[model samples]
Target: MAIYEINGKKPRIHPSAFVDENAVVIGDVVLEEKTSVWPSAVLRGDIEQIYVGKYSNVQDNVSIHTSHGYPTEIGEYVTIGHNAMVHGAKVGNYVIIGISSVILDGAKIGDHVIIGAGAVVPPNKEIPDYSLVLGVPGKVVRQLTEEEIEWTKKNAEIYVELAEKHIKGRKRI
Candidate 1:
């Protein structure tokens, strides 16, 4: 990971955070406790700075960037699935980003949202809370059921706990 400056000093990554050795992290990136930056994931914090709240995972090959008026804020217990390309977006807590999804600049997604695989969320679009978004232009396919929404959040927290174990035990391949 590349060195970064945060609040006029070094970036503050929690001791429990697992940042891949090859990932790139730049200015003002804030990674809270128990977050995992998986292999080849790039978190670009230049221009506007990026924030990853507690227990989120930037999965392999995911590129999270920031620019312009947006800061690319990701809330707690979120999962950025593999190959997801995100920039200048606001993702609320317990969101699950599907693999290969393209989240464009300025997109805002609320809590308990699910972005389907290969979906594209256009710039400045808004996804309401507990919605399932899918398609090239990423439309809200349906409102999530109460059970589904609760399950999504529950899975997020579970993944976080498991990842935390990975860090603490320092398990290696």
Candidate 2:
């Protein structure tokens, strides 16, 4: 992991969190227990703070950033998909952000929400709980079923187990 400190603020990562070697975590970031940051993911809290709760996964090539006045907060059991970008967003628990999605500044994603692939959530947008959002300017299409919500939790658990395996299998070159 390429963890760094800037302006006297360093990342605070829990012992059980798994950050891949190629991932970058910098400045005033907090990663809670069992959280996984995959390869090439970047969490840059240079201007503000970035907080990721327990059991959240930041997948490959994901970017999480904070703006001047807004901090980024990701709640527990959240799955940020590959190539996704979250800037100064507040994502609630059990949310699944799809691949290539972009969530801009001040966006609030409620619990158990699923943002579809390639969706773009504009700045200051608020998504309610159990929503199924899809589109360029992401809009709620419908509510998610109970089964779908359960699946989101399962996906997070899968990543946590996978991260544990990666940790044990890692070999230094």
Error of 1 at 16 (Å): 2.2
List TM-scores for all candidates, in order. Answer: 0.89, 0.98
Cα lDDT, model 2, residue 124 = 97
Instruction: Report the C-alpha lDDT of model 2 over 109-138, residue by residue, as the tens digit.
Output: 999999999999999999999999999889
Question: Best by lDDT, which number?
Answer: 2
In order, candidate lDDTs are 0.85, 0.96
The digit string of per-residue lDDT tens for model 1 on 58-92 reads 88899998777888999998889889989999999
lDDT of 2 at 128: 96
Clash totals in order:
0, 0
- Which run of 10 residues does model 2 get worst, by summed lDDT? 146-155
lDDT of 2 at 98: 97
